[PDB]
Design a protein around this motif. Structure first.
Motif, PDB file in Angstrom:
ATOM      1  N   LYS A  46      -9.068  -4.992   3.357  1.00  0.00           N
ATOM      2  CA  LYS A  46      -8.278  -3.778   3.234  1.00  0.00           C
ATOM      3  C   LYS A  46      -7.461  -3.698   1.944  1.00  0.00           C
ATOM      4  N   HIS A 102      -9.538   6.200   5.909  1.00  0.00           N
ATOM      5  CA  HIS A 102      -8.262   5.872   5.239  1.00  0.00           C
ATOM      6  C   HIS A 102      -7.691   6.990   4.348  1.00  0.00           C
ATOM      7  N   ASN A 123      -3.470   6.445   8.471  1.00  0.00           N
ATOM      8  CA  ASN A 123      -4.580   5.737   7.843  1.00  0.00           C
ATOM      9  C   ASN A 123      -4.923   4.407   8.520  1.00  0.00           C
ATOM     10  N   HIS A 124      -3.886   3.687   8.961  1.00  0.00           N
ATOM     11  CA  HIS A 124      -4.034   2.340   9.525  1.00  0.00           C
ATOM     12  C   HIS A 124      -4.286   2.346  11.028  1.00  0.00           C
ATOM     13  N   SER A 174     -16.058  -3.329  -0.107  1.00  0.00           N
ATOM     14  CA  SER A 174     -15.462  -4.317   0.813  1.00  0.00           C
ATOM     15  C   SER A 174     -15.863  -5.784   0.561  1.00  0.00           C
ATOM     16  N   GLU A 194       0.825  -1.191   0.000  1.00  0.00           N
ATOM     17  CA  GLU A 194       0.000   0.000   0.000  1.00  0.00           C
ATOM     18  C   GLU A 194       0.879   1.270   0.000  1.00  0.00           C
ATOM     19  N   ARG A 234      -7.255  -0.819  -0.309  1.00  0.00           N
ATOM     20  CA  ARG A 234      -6.389   0.321  -0.103  1.00  0.00           C
ATOM     21  C   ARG A 234      -5.038   0.144  -0.788  1.00  0.00           C
ATOM     22  N   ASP A 255      -9.285 -10.458   1.919  1.00  0.00           N
ATOM     23  CA  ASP A 255      -8.983  -9.375   2.852  1.00  0.00           C
ATOM     24  C   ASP A 255      -9.795  -8.112   2.528  1.00  0.00           C
ATOM     25  N   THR A 312     -16.076   2.370   0.691  1.00  0.00           N
ATOM     26  CA  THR A 312     -16.050   1.189   1.566  1.00  0.00           C
ATOM     27  C   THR A 312     -17.092   0.124   1.127  1.00  0.00           C
TER      28      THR A 312
END
Lengths: 226, 224
Positions: free
Chosen positions: B30, B193, A70-71, B19, A35, B33, B28, B16
Motif C-alpha cells: 500500500k 483508493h 479509501n482504506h 504492487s 498518506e 498510496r 508493503d 495497482t
C-alpha cells in the motif's frame, strides 16, 4: 541586521507524529499519517491552482475522511474533533527552543509562516510555549493561496519589508524550500522524520541542510561571516 | 454530443500493477498510496513555481525520496524497474466494452496525460487501446501539469471546443476539480483508493461511476 528567518510551523516547528495515535486507532496503522499528509498538501495546491480557497484545517478534515473511505475505515464526528484538537495542539520538538534562542543571539530576526488560518488565542505556537521567540506570525490566509504559490512568499517579503536575499525559508518540506527559492529566497531544510531532499535535475537544492534544528542553526549561524 | 477527455495513468491503465514493485523494495503493498500523492504534490509544486521536469522523471526522484524516508534500500536498477511497469501498465478489463459503447453513442474520445510522449509503442499502444481515441494530448508541450488551468484551456483550443462541450474523465478528484474550474464537466470513475472530496464550495463530480461501465451508463443516458 543579520537577515530574516521565516519558519514553517506544522511539522517543522511542531511535531506532526503527535497525530500518530489518531491514525493508529482509526486505521490500525500510524503510517497512514504519511498518506494523509501528502494528500492534504496535494489538495491545498489543487485548490490554489484552480482559484479555490478553504482554510487549511477544513481541507485537513475532509482529506482525513477521504483517506478513511479509501482504506475502508469507519469515521465519526468525534474522530474529526480529535483531528482538530491534535492538529492545533502539536507540541514543539525539543530541539526548537534551544536553536531559536541561539539564532536570536546571533542577531537573526525570526518570523513564522504557516498554511493554517489565524486561530483565536491561544494559537498552536502559544500552547507549545514558543510563540514569543518570533516578531511575527504570518499565514497564507491573507493571500488566499497555499504555499508554494509565489504570492505567499512575495507578500511575506513585502509585509516584512525585506528583500529576497535577506530572507531564508525554513521547512522540513522540500516543496516549501523550492517555493521560497524560486522567489530568490534562501532555503533551509531540517530533516524531520519522513522528509528527505528531492534530487531532481534543474530543481534547486536547499542552501542549508541540517538533520535537526540545532544542526541547521549552526550552519546559518556560521555563514554570518564565513 | 461532446468530447470526452480521458486521463490515462490510473484512470485507464491499471496502477495497482505496480504492487509487486512496492512489496519488493519497501515490504508493503500500500506504500503505492504514499508515493503517488507525493508524486502528484511535487508535480503541482513544480507547476506552481515555474519549474518543469518530465512526469516520469519526477516519479523516479519521488520513489527514491520515499525510499530514503522509509529508510529502505534502492539500486540503479530498482529505479529502472519502476520506469518499466509505469510505461507498461495494462488496461482494466472494463475499458474496452465501455469505450466501444461511447463511440457508438456519438461521443468523441481523447486522452490527456501528465506523462511525456514516449517511444512507441506508447503505454496506450502496448495496452492495445490506443486506436480507440482520436487524439493523444500531453502536458509536456505546456511545461505545466494538471490541474493548471492552462492544461485544460490549451486542450480546449487544440480541439476547437468550448468548455460546455467537454467532460474530463479521471479517477482523480483534483483532475475533475481542475477541469470543472474551467467550465468543463467531470466524470469520476471510482478506481481502487479514490473517493470524492466533499468540502464546501468545491465542485462535486457531475457523473459518478464505480467502474468505467457504470460511468458509461451515466454518460450515454445523459443525452436524452
Amino acid at each position: 541586521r543579520s537577515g530574516i528567518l521565516v519558519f514553517d510551523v506544522n511539522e517543522t516547528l511542531l511535531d506532526l507524529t503527535s497525530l500518530s495515535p489518531l491514525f493508529e486507532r482509526v486505521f490500525g496503522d500510524a503510517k497512514v499519517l504519511r498518506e494523509w499528509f501528502p494528500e492534504l498538501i496535494l489538495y491545498s495546491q489543487t485548490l490554489t491552482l484552480t482559484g479555490l480557497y478553504r482554510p487549511f484545517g477544513e481541507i485537513a478534515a475532509a482529506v482525513f475522511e477521504m483517506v478513511a473511505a479509501n482504506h475502508q475505515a469507519k469515521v465519526t464526528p468525534d474522530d474529526i474533533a480529535e483531528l482538530k484538537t491534535r492538529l492545533t495542539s502539536m507540541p514543539a520538538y525539543p530541539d526548537v527552543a534551544p536553536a531559536l534562542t541561539r539564532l536570536q543571539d546571533a542577531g537573526f530576526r525570526l518570523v513564522t509562516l504557516t498554511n493554517s488560518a489565524p486561530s483565536p488565542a491561544p494559537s498552536p505556537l502559544e500552547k507549545a510555549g514558543i510563540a514569543s521567540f518570533f516578531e511575527a506570525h504570518l499565514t497564507v490566509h491573507s493571500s488566499q493561496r497555499f504555499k508554494p504559490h509565489p504570492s505567499v512568499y512575495d507578500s511575506t517579503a513585502e509585509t516584512l519589508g525585506a528583500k529576497p536575499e535577506e530572507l531564508c525559508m525554513i521547512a522540513c518540506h522540500i516543496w516549501n524550500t523550492i517555493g521560497a527559492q524560486a522567489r530568490g529566497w534562501r532555503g533551509g531544510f531540517v530533516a524531520r522524520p519522513h522528509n528527505t531532499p528531492l534530487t531532481l535535475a534543474e530543481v534547486p537544492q536547499p542552501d542549508f541542510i541540517g538533520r535537526d534544528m540545532g544542526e541547521l542553526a549552526d550552519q546559518l549561524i556560521a555563514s554570518l561571516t564565513a
